[PDB]
């Protein structure tokens, strides 16, 4: 097979819930928040080593809290059925922000821009901005692209959305008046796309192959690569710890690391029998990162200090 | 209710298995081993933050590895159906030690005494010693007491065994020729017993009460205490982190801490919805400890370094 990874940095944590975790965001290195299914909200004060559940008083518990975002002590959460929560004190207290009921779709993503501003993107790809803590919104992109298979953001605030069926992708950044479609080059269907730290695009396509866009001409693509060299189910997400160190997650404990920017890969065998799919990789710094699993499991990154 | 604990030190880890973990033992602060159901064996090199599964080549996988014990780099494991494994190199390689098939019962506990010696206690309470890496055994206590509800060891090598039905308990230490029975003082049935760091006995009895034997006359007992002040299912284990700091575990995330040697208690609310029973508390030092759960969950102790 491909070589086994030398050191496994990932510790699987079972949170005090059976609900799937959908997002996480940090105020600073120590203080952060995670959100998920069935109105799940938890806090950390030690960088994510331990978590404290927090309950909100609501007439429903059925919310999928899909997105949480902080900029400093200002934080936002959105979910479906439509709900928006806001804090200005690091989540010590949370207020509901009413949403227009004719809002097409449901909130999918919120991004804290600071100073009372946030961008919200719906499940159908409409993009809205508030500058006044959600009291008034204006459409940045009013034409919906329909259900997105995946949605990711670049370091500079561009987004990439994979089409429902993975037949194409679209991009958007401030200044543009609608999503910009792009043809896929591969004969295979797209599963996920996002950005590298240098602002190139990456893609995961069906059947376990990946590729990277060409530096400074993102309409052309590099050659497909098979990280497992072999016929695999497929991968779910790709994320960078450092410019050279890339992780690739998928179902059933499948987790690979590359040390050369995604050219070659090694398998982290130690996590293979963790009883979870690994869906979404969130690095906050080179020594702080998480992988969201199912049913309250996540993985937490542990720097190797055995030779310290 | 009783007060909520101030800081929760326990992080729940999901190991790379669904098998229940039954014991753990450390070579030193960094290097240790855990064992459990369905021939589960895992190693750590970072004090238990991460674990590496290890597979043995065997004609069966049905073993409940019930006990692992190291003294330095010498280690032993025992399980049921009868099996004994031995290592002299810190578990880099493990050898099977054949057991006499007429051995009554199945091995329950092994204790590494160093220099090739170990004490083994069966499920029916017979006690055997080897001085020659298990090539020859001699009975220390040949008369079986039958199925023990629980079995624990003192800092000086005494054992206490609760009777099958919890109607009485017995003790044994070197020099004695059989288990020594004792009457219980309580009208309630015994669930678990063990030793305090000062060598007194403690007991957990049915209905959520505990008590401690009288210093330097262990045949008399102090007053029953209700840690929850309230009618509870019951507790499963009690263990000391320090002479004054005691933990009490039970079913369904129930976990209490005392800071005054077990007189008064606070509940660790943050772990209540971890989806596991907490069965067995193992402290290795004041900053290193674990609680064994079900289906590959354990809790790991995290010292509070937020003010560091």
From Swiss-Prot, chains A, B:
Any one Gene Ontology BP term: photosynthesis
Subunit structure of this chain's protein: Interacts with the D1 protein (crystallized with PsbA1 or PsbA3), via the latter's C-terminal prepropeptide, may interact with parts of the mature D1 protein as well.
Name of this chain's protein: Photosystem II assembly protein Ycf48
Record key words, sorted: Photosynthesis, Photosystem II, Signal, Thylakoid
Pfam families: PSII_BNR
Motif (Arg-rich patch) on chain: 165-189
Protein family: Belongs to the Ycf48 family.
Subcellular location: Cellular thylakoid lumen
Thylakoid as UniProt keyword: yes
Organism: Thermosynechococcus vestitus (strain NIES-2133 / IAM M-273 / BP-1)
Domain of life: Bacteria
GO CC entries: photosystem II; plasma membrane-derived thylakoid lumen
Coiled coil ranges: none
SUPFAM superfamilies hit by this protein: Oligoxyloglucan reducing end-specific cellobiohydrolase
UniProt keyword Cell membrane present: no
Biological role: A factor required for optimal assembly of photosystem II (PSII), acting in the early stages of PSII assembly. Also plays a role in replacement of photodamaged D1 (psbA). Assists YidC in synthesis of chlorophyll-binding proteins.
Free-text note on domains in this protein's UniProt record: A 7-bladed beta-propeller torus, about 54 by 46 Angstroms, with a depth of about 25 Angstroms and a central pore.
């Amino acid at each position: 097979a491909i070589p086994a990874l030398d050191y496994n940095p990932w510790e699987a944590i079972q949170l005090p819930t059976t609900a799937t975790i959908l997002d996480m965001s940090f105020i600073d290195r120590h203080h952060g928040w995670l959100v998920g299914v069935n109105a799940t909200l938890m806090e950390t004060r030690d960088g994510g080593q331990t978590w404290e559940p927090r309950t909100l008083v609501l007439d429903h518990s059925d919310y999928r809290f899909n997105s949480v975002s902080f900029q400093g002590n200002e934080g936002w959460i959105v979910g479906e059925p439509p709900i928006m929560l806001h804090t200005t004190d690091g989540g010590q207290s949370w207020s509901q922000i009413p949403l227009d009921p004719k809002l097409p779709g449901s909130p999918r993503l919120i991004k804290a821009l600071g100073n009372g501003s946030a961008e919200m993107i719906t499940n159908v790809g409409a993009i809205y901005r508030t500058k006044d803590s959600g009291k008034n919104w204006q459409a940045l992109v009013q034409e919906a692209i329909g259900v997105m298979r995946n949605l990711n953001r670049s370091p500079s605030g561009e987004y990439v959305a994979v089409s429902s069926r993975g037949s194409f992708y679209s991009t958007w950044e401030p200044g543009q008046t609608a999503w910009e479609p792009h043809n896929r080059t591969t004969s295979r269907r797209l599963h996920n796309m996002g950005f590298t730290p240098d602002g190139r695009l990456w893609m995961i396509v069906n059947g376990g192959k990946i590729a990277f866009s060409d530096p400074d001409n993102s309409e052309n693509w590099g050659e497909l690569l098979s990280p497992l060299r072999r016929n695999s189910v497929g991968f779910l997400d790709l994320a960078y710890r450092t410019p050279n160190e890339v992780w690739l997650a998928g179902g059933a404990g499948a987790l690979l690391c590359s040390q050369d920017g995604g050219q070659t890969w090694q398998q982290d065998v130690d996590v293979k029998k963790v009883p979870s799919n690994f869906y979404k990789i969130l690095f906050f710094s080179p020594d702080q990162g998480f992988i969201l699993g199912q049913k309250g499991i996540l993985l937490r990154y542990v720097t190797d200090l055995t030779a310290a």
